[PDB]
Design a protein around this ligand. Structure first.
Ligand SMILES: [Mg+2]
Ligand SMILES: [Mg+2]
Ligand SMILES: [Mg+2]
Ligand SMILES: [Mg+2]
Ligand SMILES: [Mg+2]
Ligand SMILES: [Mg+2]
Ligand SMILES: [Mg+2]
Ligand SMILES: [Mg+2]
Ligand SMILES: [Mg+2]
Ligand SMILES: [Mg+2]
Ligand SMILES: [Mg+2]
Ligand SMILES: [Mg+2]
Ligand SMILES: [Mg+2]
Ligand SMILES: [Mg+2]
Lengths: 98, 100, 127, 80, 206, 151
RNA sequence: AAGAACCUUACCUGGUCUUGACAUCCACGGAAGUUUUCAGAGAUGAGAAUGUGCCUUCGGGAACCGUGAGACAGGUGCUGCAUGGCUGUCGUCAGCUCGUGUUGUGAAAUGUUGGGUUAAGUCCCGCAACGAGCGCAACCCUUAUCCUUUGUUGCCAGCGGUCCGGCCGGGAACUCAAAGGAGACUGCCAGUGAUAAACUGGAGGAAGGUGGGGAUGACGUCAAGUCAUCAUGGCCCUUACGACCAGGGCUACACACGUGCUACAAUGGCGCAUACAAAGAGAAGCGACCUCGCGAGAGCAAGCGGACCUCAUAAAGUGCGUCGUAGUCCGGAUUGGAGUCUGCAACUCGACUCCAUGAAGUCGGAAUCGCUAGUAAUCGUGGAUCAGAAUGCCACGGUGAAUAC
């Protein structure tokens, strides 16, 4: 009944947060759906390499945005109390929709 | 880049949020099919009385570290050269070299 | 009950179910004749079946997603050979002897910076 | 103003200036730096002077010149 | 000219990132700006503290700046009487509540930024660059390293024509991606012009 | 090339007759990489070739090809102030794929209305040993005799 | 230059300012902020009504202005032949060197040459050389197959209800999504080979000899390019070469060159009907639905910061009909009129739509360019820049060759 979707710039870091969230859900006792990997978004940029001419020589960059979703289904009164500020990770977005 | 030009951008920013976040009715509200008397003709005439600094039309959107007018990138806010100088060093998170 | 094969030719992934019975083929809730129309797209589907001469023995249920005309038609030829791979076992050597088992991994390649299309450079004039 | 939905355009400074002229009719040529303004039928018979970039040239108004913008009658670049 | 940033091609392979925070497309160009304004001040304020690397992260609207240095006592001082003075202005610069903690680099001669820092301070102080860059190669290697290469270019010694001189000792593989190579650069604004300094230090291969 | 010798690719047979020789013909005739219309012309001209003269459709093709295959062709080598064209026998694999190129190119200069009508007319001409394709084949043969003193 | 109508603009004309449009100081007096009027092309000039942020400074300091004087600010001004930093290039070519030893009086040489082999100083054997480093290869990304885990906003093999729309219960099998593993190593067999490196083939395999592509560019050359991204040594203007504003120019046209789009048609034009994609973007943003308008588009206006909402109907193709080789139902320039949308503002100088007109062009002299396989050719979609404005740039897929003696 509440969806937690996690966004990060590296897969290994996003796994650290999704691993505890099911553990906390397992600590609630049961009834976790399991993290599901949504499709990844990748923005590719192409900036020129020189301060001047030689336009034909460029550099291509890319930023990825890995995605997860756990889909908490049973909202215990102790689930809501315990699921605030327990991500233990910096640089990971959190979004909870009721 | 020529600090004179950098001062223009913030003078045009200051007069952009000052007026055209509130004085937008003349160009948006009084433009459509409504009372067609001189009040619309007043709206057209009164829109020029405001200083020349309109919201979109006079913002060059230059770089934040050098003020380079060209090669801008809206996402990072730097030019095409400072992005590679705020570099692959690691200043920009999650931005690596692409190979597909 | 059913036997299965995938097929993945050129960005078009199929899925084929082979049913013993008579000879009738339905693909993506349409008949074989009307879905393709191209004579090179309704025989390439048939090519694995005619080689083993079952043709009139198998009932096929098929769903194909993505790709184009010959990409999907080639993908089905792959899946059918993979479907035949499952519920008979001694048939591999003959089936592989005529292809149909190699995935044919040939995809469209990059555009590449500095190149006009994908490998074609722009016209180069010395002076 | 390049649409009937918006209406024909003239600058405020020019609009008030021409209003004073017709109040007393034809007078000394009117010097103006406006070239983006249409020509209204209220200033027929005047000799307004547009500025092409270096000098003010007097353009004589006529009934025929009533839909053309002011700058049309001042060649901005010279040639032969 | 024909070489890529060795610290940059290895951003996702072995070398880490110097900024680890997330932000959607709306809050990126201004998160980056506040990153640059913090880095600009901290380098200038800690000029003689031999600061190596500044890594900035922003957990939940709260900037956390971690400074790496080989002289931690200079930075914090007597029971942190100055680190708070640094924190009290980072929030001003960034607009968010900060927490600056310090990590000590116990190899001041084995860091790329520190080595390139020391041998450009020397040039500004007018020591002959052959003595400067022959020292750094030996001092790093006798302290334990599998390779080092130091490169100095510019108007060396007041010569009217620019020249590049590089000393490489040991084994420094640049094409091998997995190698753990530390690279950095600095400058020297001498009375004659500008002198550039680069240094590669190769320590591990995994 | 100069270093790597290599074989040839595998050609899928045509969907109406199952002959690789006509499978190459739809490939040679095709422009812009659209086999759909390329094969549409070939069978259309092949059908009207069978009814007009000769028997079958895959047989009237092979009879026509016999009158456009060149036995000997001239290759030119540069020696001095000019070049001498030295004749050399042509291997069979090149011979088939060369006659077909002559047939199509000569059938793109016909004055008929559509390519379907042109291709069949030239193919029928070949079996009757006339046309513009067999015109080229005789010329390539004639040049060999002229320069056979340079063999 | 990843996008000059004003802006950008660094240029020109004209109108103006000076410790200044931008920063740190000293003193004086004011909370700042708000509305509006007059003169002006505008900068500005002259105002008229409106106002209070911490106390132990409360009598002034800290935020914001006005003024003064002096320190100084400012320069897209000169030298890329004084420099850093960053690039092109020979060149993805297989080379460029060192320590010790030996030879030569010596510059130097040997190692690096020689027999094969390799894409490669790659590898083996010889040899006054023995070793080492920077290069090659490998480590990296993507793609080709399989296995394990999860099943929303993705999927539907088997079940029931169907307004046969995954639509609904429902399932974790299938395509797919993204995490982790298995796989390819001349691994196995025959032959050639100096019994060696390796080579030619054979089996299995999704993949066979670095499987396809990308990233990666050694010592150095051109005192190659950039003082206009930026910084910096000198030189110079400093009531000016600094700064502000309105208009114009960067779009000028007897001509010449380069890179491209459209064509010159019948393997095509037009009309009707209808299949199949991939990747990507979105908050002063993407904008369904319905109505209106011949159309660009206008109105109300859901949904979505997103595997669901929008962009977004893909096109070449297929089926039917007509045009029968004509400057033509090919071609679409040019021009007259009528409009829509951004935008203070569309004349100089925007895009697009409606009606009419219909130019050169009927396969292009010498000469010259690209391409070896999902390649050339051909057809469409997306993105960056961006209020508006690409036939360019960057990226995706569909159809898909000929030839290598
Ligand atoms: Mg997206
Ligand atoms: Mg603009
Ligand atoms: Mg393509
Ligand atoms: Mg490079
Ligand atoms: Mg130079
Ligand atoms: Mg030069
Ligand atoms: Mg120059
Ligand atoms: Mg030598
Ligand atoms: Mg080697
Ligand atoms: Mg390599
Ligand atoms: Mg101006
Ligand atoms: Mg220009
Ligand atoms: Mg003509
Ligand atoms: Mg645009």
């Amino acid at each position: 009944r509440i969806r937690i979707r996690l966004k990060a710039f590296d897969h290994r870091l996003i796994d650290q947060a999704t691993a505890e969230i099911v553990e906390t859900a397992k600590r609630t006792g049961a009834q976790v759906r399991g993290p599901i990997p949504l499709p990844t978004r990748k923005e590719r940029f192409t900036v020129l390499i020189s301060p001047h001419v030689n336009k034909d020589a460029r550099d291509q960059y890319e930023i990825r945005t890995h995605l997860r979703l756990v889909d908490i289904v049973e909202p215990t009164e102790k689930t809501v109390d315990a699921l605030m500020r327990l991500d233990l990770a910096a640089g990971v977005d959190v979004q909870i929709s009721l | 880049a020529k600090q004179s030009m950098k001062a223009r951008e913030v003078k045009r920013v200051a007069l952009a949020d000052k007026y055209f976040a509130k004085r937008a009715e003349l160009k948006a509200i009084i433009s459509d099919v409504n009372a067609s008397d001189e009040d619309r003709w007043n709206a057209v005439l009164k829109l020029q009385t405001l200083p020349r600094d309109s919201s979109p039309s006079r913002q060059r959107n230059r770089c934040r570290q050098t003020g380079r007018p060209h090669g801008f990138l809206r996402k990072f806010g730097l030019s095409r050269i400072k992005v590679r100088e705020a570099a692959m060093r690691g200043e920009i998170p999650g931005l690596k070299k692409a190979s597909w | 009950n059913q036997y299965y094969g995938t097929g993945r030719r050129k960005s078009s992934a199929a899925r084929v179910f082979i049913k013993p019975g008579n000879g009738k083929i339905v693909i993506n809730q349409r008949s074989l004749e009307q879905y393709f129309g191209r004579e090179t797209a309704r025989m390439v589907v048939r090519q694995p079946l005619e080689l083993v001469d079952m043709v009139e023995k198998l009932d096929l249920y098929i769903t194909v997603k993505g790709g184009g005309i010959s990409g999907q038609a080639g993908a089905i030829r792959h899946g059918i050979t993979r479907a035949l791979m499952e519920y008979d076992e001694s048939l591999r050597s003959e089936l592989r002897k005529a292809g149909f088992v190699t995935r044919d991994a040939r995809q469209v390649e990059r555009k590449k910076v500095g190149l006009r299309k994908a490998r074609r450079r722009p016209q180069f004039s010395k002076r | 103003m390049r649409s009937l939905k918006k209406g024909p355009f003239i600058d405020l400074h020019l609009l008030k200036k021409v209003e004073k002229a017709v109040e007393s009719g034809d007078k000394k040529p009117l010097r103006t730096w406006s070239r983006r303004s249409t020509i209204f039928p209220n200033m027929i018979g005047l000799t307004i002077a547009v500025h092409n970039g270096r000098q003010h040239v007097p353009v004589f108004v006529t009934d025929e010149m009533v839909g053309h913008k002011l700058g049309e009658f001042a060649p901005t670049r010279t040639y032969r | 000219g024909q070489k890529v940033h060795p610290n940059g091609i290895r951003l996702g392979i072995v070398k880490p990132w110097n900024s680890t925070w997330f932000a959607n497309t709306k809050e990126f160009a201004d998160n980056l700006d506040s990153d640059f304004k913090v880095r600009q001040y901290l380098t200038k304020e800690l000029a003689k503290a031999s600061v190596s690397r500044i890594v900035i992260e922003r957990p939940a609207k709260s900037i956390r700046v971690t400074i790496h240095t080989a002289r931690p006592g200079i930075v914090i001082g007597k029971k942190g009487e100055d680190v708070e003075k640094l924190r009290k202005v980072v929030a001003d610069i960034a607009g968010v509540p900060a927490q600056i903690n310090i990590a000590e680099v116990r190899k001041p001669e084995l860091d790329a930024k520190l080595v390139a820092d020391s041998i450009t301070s020397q040039l500004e102080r007018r020591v002959m660059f052959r003595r400067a860059m022959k020292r750094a190669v030996q001092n790093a290697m006798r302290l334990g390293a599998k390779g080092i290469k130091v490169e100095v270019s510019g108007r060396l010694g007041g010569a009217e024509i620019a020249r590049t001189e590089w000393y490489r000792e040991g084994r420094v593989p640049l094409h091998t991606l997995r190698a753990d190579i530390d690279y950095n650069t600095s400058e020297a604004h001498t009375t004659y012009g500008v002198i550039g300094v680069k240094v590669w230090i190769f320590k591990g291969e995994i | 090339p100069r270093r790597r010798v290599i074989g040839q690719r595998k050609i899928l047979p045509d969907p109406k007759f199952g002959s690789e020789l006509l499978a190459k013909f739809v490939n040679i005739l095709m422009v812009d990489g659209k086999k759909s219309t390329a094969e549409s012309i070939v069978y259309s001209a092949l059908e009207t070739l069978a009814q007009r003269s000769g028997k079958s459709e895959l047989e009237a093709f092979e009879v026509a090809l016999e009158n456009v295959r060149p036995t000997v062709e001239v290759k030119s080598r540069r020696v001095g102030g000019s070049t001498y064209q030295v004749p050399v026998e042509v291997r069979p694999v090149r011979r088939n794929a060369l006659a077909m190129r002559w047939i199509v190119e000569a059938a793109r200069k016909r004055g008929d209305k559509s390519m379907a009508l042109r291709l069949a007319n030239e193919l029928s001409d070949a079996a009757e040993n006339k046309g513009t394709a067999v015109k080229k084949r005789e010329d390539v043969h004639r040049m060999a005799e002229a320069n056979k003193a340079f063999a």
